[PDB]
Design an enzyme around this catalytic site. Structure first.
Site, PDB file in Angstrom:
ATOM      1  N   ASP A   1      48.074  24.094 -27.244  1.00 42.24           N
ATOM      2  CA  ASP A   1      48.584  24.228 -25.889  1.00 42.24           C
ATOM      3  C   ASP A   1      50.047  24.641 -25.845  1.00 42.24           C
ATOM      4  O   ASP A   1      50.570  24.888 -24.754  1.00 42.24           O
ATOM      5  CB  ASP A   1      48.404  22.917 -25.117  1.00 42.24           C
ATOM      6  CG  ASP A   1      47.035  22.796 -24.481  1.00 42.24           C
ATOM      7  OD1 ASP A   1      46.469  23.835 -24.079  1.00 42.24           O
ATOM      8  OD2 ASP A   1      46.524  21.662 -24.379  1.00 42.24           O
TER       9      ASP A   1
ATOM     10  N   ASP B   1      41.697  14.106 -33.524  1.00 40.42           N
ATOM     11  CA  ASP B   1      43.113  14.147 -33.216  1.00 40.42           C
ATOM     12  C   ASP B   1      43.872  14.814 -34.361  1.00 40.42           C
ATOM     13  O   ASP B   1      43.350  15.015 -35.461  1.00 40.42           O
ATOM     14  CB  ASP B   1      43.651  12.744 -32.954  1.00 40.42           C
ATOM     15  CG  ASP B   1      43.328  12.247 -31.562  1.00 40.42           C
ATOM     16  OD1 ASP B   1      42.736  13.019 -30.779  1.00 40.42           O
ATOM     17  OD2 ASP B   1      43.668  11.087 -31.248  1.00 40.42           O
TER      18      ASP B   1
ATOM     19  N   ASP C   1      46.370  13.826 -36.204  1.00 37.34           N
ATOM     20  CA  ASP C   1      46.752  12.996 -37.338  1.00 37.34           C
ATOM     21  C   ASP C   1      45.568  12.356 -38.048  1.00 37.34           C
ATOM     22  O   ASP C   1      45.774  11.655 -39.044  1.00 37.34           O
ATOM     23  CB  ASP C   1      47.723  11.907 -36.878  1.00 37.34           C
ATOM     24  CG  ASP C   1      47.247  11.194 -35.630  1.00 37.34           C
ATOM     25  OD1 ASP C   1      46.596  11.845 -34.788  1.00 37.34           O
ATOM     26  OD2 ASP C   1      47.524   9.984 -35.490  1.00 37.34           O
TER      27      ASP C   1
ATOM     28  N   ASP D   1      38.062  10.451 -22.266  1.00 33.24           N
ATOM     29  CA  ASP D   1      36.961  10.114 -23.161  1.00 33.24           C
ATOM     30  C   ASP D   1      36.054   9.047 -22.557  1.00 33.24           C
ATOM     31  O   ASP D   1      34.824   9.190 -22.543  1.00 33.24           O
ATOM     32  CB  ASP D   1      37.532   9.649 -24.498  1.00 33.24           C
ATOM     33  CG  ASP D   1      38.740   8.748 -24.329  1.00 33.24           C
ATOM     34  OD1 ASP D   1      39.126   8.484 -23.171  1.00 33.24           O
ATOM     35  OD2 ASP D   1      39.306   8.306 -25.349  1.00 33.24           O
TER      36      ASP D   1
END
Ligand code: C2E
Ligand code: C2E
Lengths: 793, 144, 45, 42
Positions: A266, A313, A315, A410
């Site tokens: 993004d 995600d 990480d 979510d």
């Protein structure tokens, strides 16, 4: 004048005294202290037979076993301490038919419920209540030492009976309808405790029976395996944190014909575009940035063409077994539309980093991802938790993609899928590890966002009153949403005794003995039942610390939504303001209570003691919270994971030596060599790592040599070397499972001792820095008295 | 020896002394502080060999049993030996009634909870020092 | 007054009430264990 | 004389009417506080 001393005193004793005086003068100790010490020594050796070899042998290992006593540091009232410790030690110890079966169940259940009602609603005299307490507590203790699920159910039912008894007693014979001030606050406390009881009951229901779902083996044919698309949405994370995720994804043990990895950006960053081009994965950078991560994922779905979508995600690094351990159920249940995987954090959390307990205490989130989601699995209420999940794209297209309304997208999309009839599943094995929040502020912020989203879902979708959705699912979702409304009850609990101590207001109109005989069994049974149920997930009395850290920051946003690299150690004053304010209020209350214990009515002697012990517990909790708010030093660019693997090192002259890898990070390793074979602080070394039977070589440079321990720094690796290194260090499907299984069990007394030490450490931390100077003196005085008492236990 | 590490404590006799203290407090005992103190000193007498320690415990078990019987208000052995034949010749109903009237469930519950508390304490708080102190206090009060 | 009568029946009997509570706990635990086993088997199929 | 009849009712029933009076007082206090804040902001 030495002649007079030599004549009066035998020369050996005179020399001993002179030497001791000189030693204490050199160390700055007072001469009077030396005289008192010698006086005590002589009076003991004449009034106490220190010549006994038994006591000499005890003194031989006294320093190692009892290092808290120093023979070279005299202090006032030392013999009192010796006698007290001696007294502590001497005290201390060194089938059938349908109708018949249904009728039998009915009669058994009604008899048991009638007995439980009698047990709950039986008035007692204090001795009878105490006997009842001891008997039921002993039953709980016996059932504790019995592994299995039947014992868990027994403890749940016993705790429910005790808690219902407590609530019945509170609602019947504690509310004092005499005063307009001893009524409003008393009812406020009663409502807080009723909310806590409801939360406890719903939590017991939620984890009453963990499903313990197991992976279903995939078909032997590789042509029946489905196509999976992996999404990695990024907004502002540096490439150094997404590289490992992408490298681990490229090494997933799934057919490459049926695995597409996408990088969603993004930020429109060109470095990510070039990285995607170099590694061979896909890339999407949408022009319009709307709906944040949900909108990014929807735009990605607009281009991706795969049966399954797995969201990771930035990480979170997946293990190579992730898809094989996950995809089995999707081919077994056609109605399944969502699978969840635990969230593990190899990075130390703010609590673990600041409080110094990283591998000792379990993580904050391992209770949820270890027991709560497994409990939700039975009732088909396992909701999407952001990452480490797979969603079938056919159900996800019917609902219009990821929900974009709430900030917790979510949970919203999982709720929609459950409301359209699709099921969900949970798998216990940790197959992905991420980075924890780097500071207390980050943890507060992410919890605030989660709570805001959950309250938004409660207000908008309202799982209690909607469309087709099972009742157990409703209860699980509303419990998850009520978990974030516990700030107000926690504030009430922390500020309740201050009512009575400051402004005379009998919150509970009962003798202190009856309060101790009714409230205490509730707490004891709750603690025991949780310690058995959430055994290797959360240590006792720690949930209150998290709750009090979050409460002041979660209560305002939740209520509003209901209506509508540490260079130097420091204390986060802005974060810690509420804790300091509550500490000031509670300690001014304890000063007023100390006054009232003497200048107040004598009949209110036990009540003041009860209020004071409540204030002391509050102060310990708040001190732990403050101890969280001091950030420890962090100068490591990459976080290290302690893992023991055999390895080997290769030098440029061709000599190989064995070594044991002790920790690894993104750009380095730490090894131990038995004897420091051959290595110097700048030499290049090839590091040999084995993944099963295959050996991999990685160029390294030595950074530190401290005897057996050697620190290595990774050389610039190629893409294939990066993939191999991730597969040999991070994406191993054994590190996280054994990490979670190595957590020590829950010992309530040791946990209490640790929390007390943590509160003392937090007070000592605040005894150095002070926002309002005035608080400095008070904190120093408190720490002084506290350590004096600790030295006199 | 140099250490005399044989003062291992009363061990299981702490429960015996606690039962005696509780019965005396209830008022059903003819307590003998001197005999109790002598028995406690016998139990705490240091012995070098463990075999002698075990033999001392085995010898003290019937001595303690007899002392406990003597300190109660139950009739002496002469009445039992004289009325054993009569008890044997009595009907079963009378014996059952006497047994039922002899047993107090409150006493059994108190003894059981005291035993559980003694177990918990002996796990965390040793009891030999407390028992010795209580016996000394009782002896001093009785003599003075 | 029937609840008064029931309370006066067991006014000073803690051992008996402990026994009754343990009996109720064990029986309810058995019923819940059976039901949860049934639901678990239906859930994994 | 609404206060007189309110006190008489509170004397008649001290359990339910006390709670109702407390709730009404809380609601009135909240409404008055909001109105005063709005007036002050003008
Ligand atoms: N030059 C250098 N020396 C290293 C490095 N890693 C370890 N050492 C040395 O090894 C000692 C043991 O550190 P540890 O086992 O990691 O155990 C460490 C670790 O748990 C913690 N610690 C210290 N500094 C940091 C830090 O910046 N970040 C984190 N996360 N922990 C730190 O304190 C413990 C004691 O550390 P020290 O007192 O500094 O003592 C350190 C230090 O002398 C490294 O990357 N570079
Ligand atoms: N697993 C592992 N990797 C090691 C070890 N020693 C060095 N490395 C790797 O080598 C890099 C350079 O460390 P440095 O030259 O000692 O320079 C270090 C050192 O001066 C300091 N530092 C980091 N951690 C510690 C620590 O625990 N204690 C002390 N005293 N200094 C530390 O920060 C610098 C940057 O370190 P990093 O960012 O961690 O980056 C480290 C890390 O990737 C080791 O014992 N184990």
């Amino acid at each position: 004048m030495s002649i007079l001393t030599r004549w009066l005193l035998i020369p050996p004793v005179n020399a001993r005294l002179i030497g001791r005086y000189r030693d204490y003068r050199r160390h700055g100790a007072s001469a009077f202290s030396a005289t008192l010490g010698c006086f005590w020594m002589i009076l003991a050796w004449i009034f106490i037979p220190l010549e006994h070899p038994r006591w000499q042998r005890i003194r031989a290992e006294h320093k190692n076993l009892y290092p808290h006593i120093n023979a070279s540091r005299p202090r006032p009232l030392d013999p009192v301490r010796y006698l007290i410790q001696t007294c502590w030690l001497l005290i201390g110890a060194s089938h059938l038919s349908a109708g018949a079966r249904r009728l039998i169940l009915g009669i058994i259940v009604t008899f048991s419920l009638i007995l439980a009602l009698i047990c709950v609603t039986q008035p007692f005299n204090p001795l009878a209540q105490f006997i009842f307490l001891m008997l039921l507590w002993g039953v709980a203790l016996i059932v504790r030492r019995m592994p299995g699920r039947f014992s868990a159910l027994m403890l749940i039912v016993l705790s429910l009976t005790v808690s219902c008894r407590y609530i019945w007693w509170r609602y019947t014979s504690t509310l004092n309808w005499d005063d307009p001030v001893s009524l409003v606050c008393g009812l406020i406390l009663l409502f807080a405790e009723t909310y806590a009881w409801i939360v406890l009951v719903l939590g017991y229901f939620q984890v009453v029976w963990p499903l313990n779902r197991q992976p279903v083996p995939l078909p032997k044919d590789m042509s029946l395996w489905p196509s999976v698309d992996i999404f990695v949405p990024t907004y502002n994370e540096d490439l150094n944190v997404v590289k490992n995720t992408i490298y681990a994804s490229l090494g997933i043990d799934w057919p490459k014909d049926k695995l597409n990895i996408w990088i969603l950006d993004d930020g429109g960053r060109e470095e990510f575009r070039q990285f995607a081009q170099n590694v061979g994965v896909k890339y999407i950078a949408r022009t319009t940035h709307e709906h944040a991560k949900a909108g990014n994922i929807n735009n990605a779905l607009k281009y991706a063409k795969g049966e399954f979508v797995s969201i990771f995600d930035c990480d979170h690094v997946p293990t190579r077994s992730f898809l094989q351990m996950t995809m089995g159920w999707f081919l077994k249940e056609k109605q399944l539309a969502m699978m969840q995987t635990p969230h593990h954090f190899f990075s130390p959390d703010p609590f673990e980093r600041n409080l110094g307990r990283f591998r000792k205490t379990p993580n904050e989130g391992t209770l949820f991802y270890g027991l709560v989601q497994d409990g939700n699995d039975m009732w088909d209420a396992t909701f999407f938790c952001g990452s480490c999940a797979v969603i079938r794209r056919k159900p996800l297209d019917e609902i219009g993609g990821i929900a974009v309304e709430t900030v917790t997208e979510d949970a919203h999309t999982s709720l929609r899928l459950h409301r359209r009839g699709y099921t969900s599943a949970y798998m216990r094995i940790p197959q992905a590890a991420g980075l924890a929040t780097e500071s207390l502020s980050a943890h507060i912020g992410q919890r605030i966002r989660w709570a805001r989203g959950m309250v938004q879902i409660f207000r908008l979708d309202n799982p209690l009153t909607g469309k087709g959705l099972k009742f157990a699912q409703r209860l699980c979702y509303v419990n998850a949403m009520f978990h974030f409304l516990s700030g107000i009850p926690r504030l009430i609990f922390l500020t309740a005794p201050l009512a009575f101590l400051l402004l005379h207001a009998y919150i509970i109109y009962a003798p202190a003995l009856m309060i101790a005989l009714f409230v205490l069994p509730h707490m004891i049974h709750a603690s025991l039942t949780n310690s058995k149920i959430q055994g290797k997930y959360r240590h006792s009395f720690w949930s209150e610390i998290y709750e009090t850290v979050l409460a002041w920051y979660i209560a305002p946003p939740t209520l509003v939504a209901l209506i509508n690299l540490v260079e130097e150690e420091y204390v986060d004053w802005v974060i810690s303001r509420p804790y300091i304010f509550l500490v000031l209020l509670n300690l001014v209350g304890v000063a007023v209570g100390i006054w009232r214990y003497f200048y107040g009515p004598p009949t209110e002697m036990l009540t003041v003691v009860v209020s004071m012990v409540w204030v002391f517990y509050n102060l310990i909790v708040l001190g732990g919270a403050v101890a969280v708010s001091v950030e420890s030093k962090q100068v490591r660019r990459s976080h290290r994971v302690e893992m023991t693997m055999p390895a080997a090192i290769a030098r440029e002259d061709g000599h190989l030596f064995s070594c044991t890898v002790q920790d690894f990070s993104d750009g380095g390793l730490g090894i131990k060599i038995n004897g420091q074979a051959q290595i110097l602080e700048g030499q290049k070394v090839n590091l040999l790592l084995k993944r099963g039977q295959q050996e991999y070589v990685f160029p390294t440079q030595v950074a530190r040599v401290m005897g057996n321990e050697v620190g290595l720094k990774l050389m610039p690796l190629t893409t294939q070397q990066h993939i191999d290194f991730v597969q040999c260090t991070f994406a191993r499907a054994d590190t996280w499972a054994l990490w979670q299984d190595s957590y020590p069990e829950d010992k309530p007394l040791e946990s209490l001792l640790d929390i007390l030490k943590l509160g003392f450490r937090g007070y000592r931390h605040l005894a150095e820095f002070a926002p309002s100077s005035v608080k400095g003196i008070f904190r120093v005085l408190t720490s002084l008295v506290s350590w004096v008492v600790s030295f006199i236990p | 020896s140099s250490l005399w590490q044989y003062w291992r404590g009363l061990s299981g006799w702490n429960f015996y002394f606690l039962v005696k203290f509780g019965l005396l407090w209830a008022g059903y005992l003819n307590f003998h502080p001197l005999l109790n103190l002598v028995f406690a000193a016998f139990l705490l007498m240091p012995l070098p060999r463990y075999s002698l320690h075990r033999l001392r415990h085995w010898i003290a078990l019937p001595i303690g049993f007899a002392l406990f019987w003597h300190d109660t208000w139950l009739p002496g052995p002469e009445s039992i030996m004289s009325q054993g034949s009569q008890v044997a010749g009595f009907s079963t109903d009378y014996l059952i009634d006497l047994v039922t009237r002899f047993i107090n469930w409150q006493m059994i519950g108190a003894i059981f909870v005291l035993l559980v508390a003694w177990l918990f304490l002996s796990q965390w708080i040793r009891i030999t020092v407390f028992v010795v102190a209580i016996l000394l206090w009782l002896n001093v009060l009785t003599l003075a | 007054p029937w609840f008064e009568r029931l309370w006066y029946a067991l006014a000073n009997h803690p051992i008996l009430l402990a026994v009754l509570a343990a009996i109720s706990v064990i029986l309810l635990a058995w019923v819940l264990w059976r039901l949860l086993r049934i639901i678990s088997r239906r859930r994994l199929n």
